[PDB]
């Protein structure tokens, strides 16, 4: 469960055998983010520091920081893949709200036009693009937070 | 003023016309940090995002993230200049506690590394001149280890 700031695996609701992964786990900025096989213990490129940057409780905004690279999960365009570019912590496209979907959460960009984290094509297999796409109350837009 | 998380200029108590500045303001990792003139408006390399990563109130730990580069203020050595390298957010050397320098007030603070032995954010040699090195140095809560958080 999401209990505020901390380190987490972020796991797609339709495919809990997978997690959110910065592709190839390199220190170069700009990796795209996809679902990937979890393993028994997650790799640091598949662990994320949720870091509070504004507000609290209902008004909390967070950076979602890759543990390996230190880069921030960012939406660039609606219905396009998310990535971890080098970006200012004050850029709203790198800021997210984490809200109960109805346990299970949506991850919503501070720029409302950019939407929420969404697994492309409702995939349940490793290597699926994770998009920022407009909210549709769909199961591929729901996520678990597993504290690590 | 400090309210926990936020974007700030971090201003040394002895030299309030200066702030904490990532030297040269480039995007490459590894800038050292010095004091530098505030100016009429802050440059982005002299703005810092305080981001909560663990705990709360008394047990709060923060990243202090450069606004321009997104790299984290880090202590690398005892009594040595601080820097903004590329580093994991879970690395204790990049994590800080921000504590009132004296009780019964909420305006002057110490900035304390999570690695105890790395100490406090310190203006070298009590300098009041622009361009002074900012160190992680032995923690004494001296006046060169006290800081204000200014923010619009």
Curated annotation (Swiss-Prot), chain A:
Signal sequence coordinates: none
GO molecular function terms attached to this record: carbohydrate binding
Protein residues bound to beta-D-galactosyl-(1->3)-N-acetyl-D-galactosamine: 21-24, 45
Any Pfam family: RicinB_lectin_2
Keywords, alphabetical: Lectin
InterPro entries listed in its UniProt record: Ricin_B-like_lectins, Ricin_B_lectin
Annotated function: Lectin that primarily recognizes glycans with a non-reducing terminal N-acetylgalactosamine (GalNAc), with a preference for the alpha- over the beta-anomer. Can also bind non-reducing terminal galactose (Gal) residues but with a lower affinity. Strongly interacts with glycolipid type glycans with terminal non-reducing Gal or GalNAc but fails to bind sialylated or fucosylated forms of the same glycans. Strongly interacts with galactosylated N-glycans, displaying highest affinity for alpha-1-3 branched mono-antennary N-glycans but also binding to multi-antennary glycans.
Quaternary structure and partners: Homodimer.
Record protein name field: Agglutinin
Organism: Sclerotinia sclerotiorum
